[PDB]
Structure formats: C-alpha cells, structure tokens
Design a protein around this ligand. Sequence first.
Ligand SMILES: [Cl-]
Lengths: 213, 228
Amino acid sequence: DIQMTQSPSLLSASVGDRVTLSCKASQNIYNYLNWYQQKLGEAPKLLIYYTDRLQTGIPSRFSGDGSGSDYTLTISSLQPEDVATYFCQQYNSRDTFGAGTKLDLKRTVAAPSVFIFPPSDEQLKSGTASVVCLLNNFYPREAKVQWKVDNALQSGNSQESVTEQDSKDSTYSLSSTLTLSKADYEKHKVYACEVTHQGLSSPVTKSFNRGEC
Amino acid sequence: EVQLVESGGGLVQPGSPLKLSCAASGLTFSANWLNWIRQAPGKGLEWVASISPDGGSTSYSDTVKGRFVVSKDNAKKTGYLQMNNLRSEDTAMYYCARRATRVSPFDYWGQGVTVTVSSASTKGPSVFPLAPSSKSTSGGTAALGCLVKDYFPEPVTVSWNSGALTSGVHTFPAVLQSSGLYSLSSVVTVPSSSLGTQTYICNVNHKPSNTKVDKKVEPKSCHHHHHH
Ligand SMILES: [Cl-]
C-alpha cells in the first residue's frame, strides 16, 4: 500500500495565525490527495480536493499545495472554529488516510465557573452515591480538582474527564465524579470539591451537607 | 440537497454477522460510488469497501475480503454492508460515503454507526439527574445535567430536549470504571431565571442494549443558612 504520514500529530497556535499541516506519502501520488476536517462526534468534512481545489462552501482561508510525495494544507488566519483533527487521503492506489493532525489554540486565561451536584434520590435508592463537580468554560486546560470529605482530602474514589476545546470560545470544561457506596456515603457530613486554576487567585470550594437536598 | 443516513450497529459476538444500511436522498447510487470507511482509535480512518454506480463492480480491503459484502437497492435508494464472521479487529464506527467517480473526493458522508465485536454482555445505562440548585448556580447562570452510569459497551448518545437545546451543552468523554463499565455526564448551563418555567430532559440512547431513556431534570432546594 501507499502509506500517508501526517506531521505534526499535535499543532498548537493562536487565533489569526498561519498554520501549515504536512502530509507525506510513501511514494508518488501525482496530486491525488484530498483533505478533510473532523470534529468530535461528527463525520469527516471535505475541505480541499485534488491537492489544491477548494471545496464549495469552505472558507477561502483554507488552501492546499504539494506534488510528488509531499503535500501541505494551510490555514491563513486561524479562527476558533478551526480547532479539529485534519486527515489527508490519497486515491492513487487503494485508498489510504493519514493518522491526522490535531489543532488546538492558546487564548487568554479564563477562570472556571464551579458547580456541585448532590447524589440523586434514584441512585441512593440503588445503593450508591455519586457526587459531581463541574468546571465550566476555562482556559488553560490544566485544572486541579480535589475532593474533600469533612475537609479530609480524598483519593482513589473519583474520576474526571475534560471536553474537547470549544468551537466558539476556545475553552474547556471538566467533569469530576466522586463515588461511594451508600454506606460509606452516610459516614460523613460535608462533601466538597476544591478547584485550583490559573484564573483563580485562590482555591474555589463548592460544598454541600449530605441529606440537605 | 444531499443526505446519507446510516442504520444498524450495536454489539455482536465474534463469529456473528451484522448488516448496515445507508439511505440516500438528494442523490442516487446509480450515478455515484457508494463507499464504506471505518474509524477506530489508533487506526484513524480506513477504507473498507465500495460498489460501482452500475452495481457491476465491488471492491474490498484485504482485511475484510471474503467476510464483507456490499450491495444496493436502487428502489430504496439504499446501500448495504453485510458483515459476516466479525472479529474484534472489526470494531469501529462505520461511515458510508459517496464519490461521483473513483477520482472524486468523499464530499458526502453518513453520520456513522458503531459496530462493537465482543464476547462481553451488553449493559444498559442508569440515568440519574444532576439537579440545578443554588449549589450549581453562578451569577445568573445555573448548571444541570444527567449522569449516565454503568453501561457497556460505548457509545451512549445524549441530546437535550430532543435536540432543541444545544447551546451551552457539554457532553463529556466517557470514563472507564474499574468494573469494565463506562460512565459519562452531560451538562447544560442556562439562565437561573429559566428554572421555574423551562423543562429540561436528557435523551439517552445506547444502541447495543436497545435502550432509550428520557430523564426529566428538575430543580432542588439546596439553600440553607443552617444545616439540621
Ligand atoms: Cl446522620
């Protein structure tokens, strides 16, 4: 087969910058190369076809170039909605795609909004207590959540995950859930999540008392 | 305008068969090449098979040749992919895509459906409300959501108010629990002033276990100066 190599795997820039993505084929593909953009949860979207032809409806700021084995996609003025993974595809031989280049943006610091959710009556009835802490729309991505029960720092009972970068404001959100059996849950009073982030002068704590709602 | 919509998918035991379909509108597969492309973590995008506009010609990747069969029903304006003797290596999201000629690009794609090949049993999600309250309010905005716990395999699909609510929605990547089961949360921020009049319902779909859940999420009273 003809194998496609994309570089770099992760590309970081800022709004307004010029970004160039690389795609090299293991052998000549004679301009038979297309470019797609894919966002989380969506099908790939055609941007450039036959090396340098702009797909209808695609912003003029996208352009393709190359020949032989070496190709590039260029975005002339990065916009927030350009954050995505970009794939190249050759169709000289049997179709093959590159492994993709992921684009992310730096923007000004934005402090998280912090929210906490007591366990559901439904879930408690099933014998488990999940407490959820939400950190909404912040930047940079690095954010430390610490669970404290009666002000004692927890470990081993929580899981978190972060969103892809937002298409409009370039921020991230973060969800953290602490899970205890209902028996362990009913052993303590105060459940708190404590958030540290570049955007916060000092830790922000949101908490509730078990049984209060 | 053109649209491709796929159907089918779910969890299948190794060795077993599954069939996918792709329904077209705004175009006919009598004038286009129907292609199947699959995507899985660590394997990017991978071309699987195609059938010609005149339907006389089928092509397959080495890895699926002899197990997979592509077909069409021009009456239904629909294409199919019969998958036989599935292996775990086949686990992926499967897309249909059209190209006018073999040298044209894939300009229209289906939405993707997931095929999971596993010996493990499916498990439907438990859906619990993340209720708005003073504790999930910040300024004039309230957060609310749903916690989708203890399901297998991925994925679960979440919408809000049947798709009418998308602004400020954050559906997070699932996490892997030590039990092998999966969990995820979906949240929305809305005006805190809207909690008394607006209804918020999370629509949770888990194809592998044939489950669809609509969970109404309602406000709780959590504001106390003194805890009894
Ligand atoms: Cl008590």
